[model samples]
Target: GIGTGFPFDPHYVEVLGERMHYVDVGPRDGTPVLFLHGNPTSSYVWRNIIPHVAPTHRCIAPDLIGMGKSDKPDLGYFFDDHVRFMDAFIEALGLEEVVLVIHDWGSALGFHWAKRNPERVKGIAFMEFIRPIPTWDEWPEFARETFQAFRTTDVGRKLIIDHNVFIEGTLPMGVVRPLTEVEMDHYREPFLNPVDREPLWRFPNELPIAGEPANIVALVEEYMDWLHQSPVPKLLFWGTPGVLIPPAEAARLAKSLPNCKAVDIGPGLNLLQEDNPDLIGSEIARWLSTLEI
Candidate 1:
């Protein structure tokens, strides 16, 4: 039942001496639409959505290193580590003129890449992503408490690494509907071991909160400036009472970010893809048809 929608052939390529798994479908030469997932999720997040876009654009989704089927190399699994492997993976594939579909921490990675290589990016479609969280007080009280707990050193290890809560708890909780047993099993597969869950643990800590992890905060602010000024077409998919980009934040983004269109994908939470894949997919495909690329 799980991944039944993802019928595409799997492909792997070497990136930074590690094997990175991905699925590439549709016309090879079509303007590439890159789908990037974040924290505890793999390329599987885009399974249903990709089919809607693949008919017109080249759809490629890669499982981040240390997650999904990608090889888990011995490393710190920090923000920079993901960035390094992502850069190398893009280089390996020689992807150009890309349209990015991003979510969660992958939003930061894709935005950072696009900010640095503006010429290569054609557009961006994002949801539940990073933005300047100037202070923890500004965040939703419940999320602030949850993420603060996750960032704590010992607590994080016990919760994420020892118990595998991110895969078992967070993933399902982020969505609006109940997930199937097979779906949960597929998500749990890659991080079955305590050691393999380091990336999941590190991601919560990497989230720039109140100026902590000064570099990540600065990186988000930097890309945010580019996001406001850049002429590149941008699409925002937000859900009602969402975890990250709630309706309020979505409104702010639509008003401030130039050339950005915000679409309300209805009742959902952090993982909008799981809750509204059909609408998400159809909207994106319709939007793509209007774009020059």
Candidate 2:
């Protein structure tokens, strides 16, 4: 199949007994960089960005388990599952120094990795992938009805897993432009049926709302402190009216990070990568250029 808009060969490695797929571009000895995508997306999310940065830094974007070419087990696709797979992905690759460029669930997962391996984490850059580890009382009402409606019973299953509208609907809704047929296939091709869509269903359901995913939320709270306290350089990218981290929230988050520099990339939504990949990629490269590392 003439798939996705990337110009790289697909590579696979056995991690945690699962044969996971990734795109490893650029020089191996170059600065190690990890591009972790959230649910409903694969390494293809980095297609527009990697081409710009890979020449200077090693870019490794993995299909988080069950989301892309990664082998899908019959697991529940819990928060722990994503973390564990990410752990394996990093350990098996023996990445010592990493700059995390994270989005969506990737921001949470990457923070967990960074806090645990602070000495090894060189730097971090994040966008709409941020979170506040919020419970319902702290969340806005629209989020209340919206998040609640998404995971109820029939509607939850139908939207999240069965019809796979989480991807077919939610993904497009979060981004700026309508996904081209080819781009849509790059995402839809991975989850052909209900079983294959389990990861998509399970992700939003694991939002840790109302303390349901208590463990995940707790980890987020823990890492939120780490983000504020860690000496590693951090960059925050925000577009306009993002569904999750809006400009105000982005500013609040940026203020919390002691060493963070915030950059504005004009207008877009949550997955602004589609709208501003060049901006994001180039901005990040420029930011890193200023750093001694």
Candidate 3:
């Protein structure tokens, strides 16, 4: 289930005393590029794009703690918890001069890390990610009901933990392309029961429900500031009708960034990678080639 015919090897690094699984490909002497994923998915999400970029750059993607093949420790699985392991993963590898490719919650983490270490982030290419805490007022009726149910109501636990709604429901709903049963199984295999689904449960809670999760808000502020003013070359990819980062929001983000180039990959939903991996990888490579950095 790990490689799944991907042109990469599975490797483990001991980070924070847990066995961390990552896919490391491409050249050692080449520029480092990190691909990070979000809840309910692992680095396997990058299988398509990584192969395309690997020959020229070092592509490394680690499964987030408690997800994928990574060791599951019984804990809160909060954003802070993810941060701790990610910090160790980077430090353990001694990665420097990194290019970041981010999606979903990884977008927030990627941007936050870039903000903290401007010199380390050579460039960033991100798609369909949340860089800021969404306001309740900004959500539509459907979005409000969906998010509220996921965070506040008992339905949250029932759907995510009890019923496997995210893997069985939202994931397929988000992607435009049809995922094979085999593909779905890999994502499904990680969170087989309620106890194993802590990471997914914790992800939506990071949303700024009722203006809470102040740590998230504070972090978003820092990264959003950097996103707006950082001279680092940035490429922003957007697809149609995303639950988060829709066309309007994407445009607004592009306007804010001093040096970001926004490109529409077209017709996908939240899971743009599955919908347009060819374009996602190609466009990033194309954009990076233009940057002299």
What C-alpha lDDT values do all the predictions have?
0.89, 0.81, 0.82
Give TM per candidate. Answer: 0.97, 0.93, 0.94
Backbone clash total for model 2 is 1
lDDT of 2 by residue, 37-106 (tens): 9878888888888877887888899999998888998888888898998998898988878889999889
lDDT of 3 at 116: 85
Pairs in steric clash, model 1 = none
Candidate 1 TM-score, true structure as reference: 0.97
lDDT of 1 at 253: 93
How displaced is residue 30 in candidate 2, in Å? Answer: 2.6
Badly placed stretches (over 4 Å) of model 1 are: 1-5
Best by TM-score: 1
lDDT digits (tens) for residues 1-293 of candidate 3: 12344455779999988999999988788578899999679988898888778777788899999998899999789888988899889999999788999988888878878888899988999987875545676654445676678885488988888888888987887787788888898789888867899788789888654556887877777788778888998899898776667789989988888888998988877778888888888887777677654
How many steric overlaps are in each model, in order?
0, 1, 0
Is 1 or 2 the stronger prediction by lDDT? Answer: 1
lDDT of 1 at 137: 78
Question: What is the overall TM-score of model 3 with all chains considered together?
Answer: 0.94
Clashing pairs in 3: none
Task: Tell me how far the alpha carbon of residue 28 in candidate 2 is from the true structure, in angstroms, after superposition.
Answer: 2.0
